[PDB]
Amino acid sequence: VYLDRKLLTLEDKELGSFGTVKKGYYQMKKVVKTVAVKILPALKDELLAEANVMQQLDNPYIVRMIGICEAESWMLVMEMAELGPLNKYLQQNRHVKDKNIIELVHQVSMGMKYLEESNFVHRDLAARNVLLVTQHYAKISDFGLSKALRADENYYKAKWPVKWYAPECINYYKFSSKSDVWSFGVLMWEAFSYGQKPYRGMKGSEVTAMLEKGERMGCPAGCPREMYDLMNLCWTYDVENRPGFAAVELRLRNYYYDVVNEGHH
Numbered sequence: 465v466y467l468d469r470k471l472l473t474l475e476d477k478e479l480g481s482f483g484t485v486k487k488g489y490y491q492m493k494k495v496v497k498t499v500a501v502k503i504l505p506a507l508k509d510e511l512l513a514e515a516n517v518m519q520q521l522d523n524p525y526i527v528r529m530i531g532i533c534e535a536e537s538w539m540l541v542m543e544m545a546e547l548g549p550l551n552k553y554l555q556q557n558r559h560v561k562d563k564n565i566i567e568l569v570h571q572v573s574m575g576m577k578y579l580e581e582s583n584f585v586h587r588d589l590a591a592r593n594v595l596l597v598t599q600h601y602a603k604i605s606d607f608g609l610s611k612a613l614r615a616d617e618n619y620y621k622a623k624w625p626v627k628w629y630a631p632e633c634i635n636y637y638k639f640s641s642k643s644d645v646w647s648f649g650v651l652m653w654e655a656f657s658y659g660q661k662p663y664r665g666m667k668g669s670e671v672t673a674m675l676e677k678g679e680r681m682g683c684p685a686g687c688p689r690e691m692y693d694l695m696n697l698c699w700t701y702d703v704e705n706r707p708g709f710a711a712v713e714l715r716l717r718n719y720y721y722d723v724v725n726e727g728h729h
């Protein structure tokens with residue numbers, strides 16, 4: 465898991481901003497692999513906890529960690545998803561078609577169904593934390609808030625991304641894969657809204673209040689009703705009645721095949 469600083473070449477250009485994300489290349493036994501490197505008391509331990517989660521995960525829809533390096537600062541070295549975060553990608557590429565958006569959100573749901581099966585909670589599932597390897601290949605990243613669930617519990621009991629959080633996170637501090645489903649609803653809303661931020665012009669406290677009145681964000685212009693219906697299902701107030709990701713992924717999987725069919729027609 466511990467990498468050799470010698471074998472890492474980082475570019476001077478920042479990709480963006482814990483600290484910074486830089487692009488780099490890492491010398492493997494034969495190939496060079498292009499990498500995205502997160503570069504940094506509580507912040508070190510957090511980086512290391514994040515690396516500890518990622519070490520445990522192995523799925524085509526989840527960013528792979530190469531390892532960690534302690535050099536100028538602590539660094540978390542991951543495979544590079546070249547096209548970057550989904551929200552910035554859709555803001556910058558408004559021509560992306562709805563069939564392609566469904567593909568990508570379905571890939572996210574396959575990755576989440578895997579995280580659920582593995583009993584990890586992401587706790588920061590948002591379009592900014594979905595990274596594009598290509599325009600047809602999304603992978604989930606950014607595990608800095610993620611928790612491995614205890615063997616005996618199905619929720620983790622705790623500066624939060626409130627607009628992505630389910631009511632029970634806000635009201636009871638409880639985080640389960642069902643609360644990640646709520647977030648995956650907001651992520652879908654983002655995806656079908658050209659990557660715009662949710663609950664425009666509202667503070668978190670007004671969001672919680674909106675949601676407690678049973679109000680939900682409206683359908684994004686041009687969004688398939690079946691996708692908006694699925695967003696609404698993810699935003700089921702009562703955690704016990706909210707679907708898990710197996711149910712979610714099956715719904716998206718079937719809709720995706722329907723759309724692919726209409727396209728061949």
Ligand SMILES: CCc1cccc(Nc2cc(N[C@@H]3CCCC[C@@H]3N)nnc2C(N)=O)n1
Nearest residue numbers: 479480481485500542543544545548592605
């Ligand atoms: C910098 C924006 C940016 C542009 C291009 C690639 C990447 N790569 C990543 C960013 C990241 N986290 C950032 C952290 C800051 C906000 C955006 C994003 N969630 N996590 N993993 C990768 C990766 N493995 O390729 N990031």
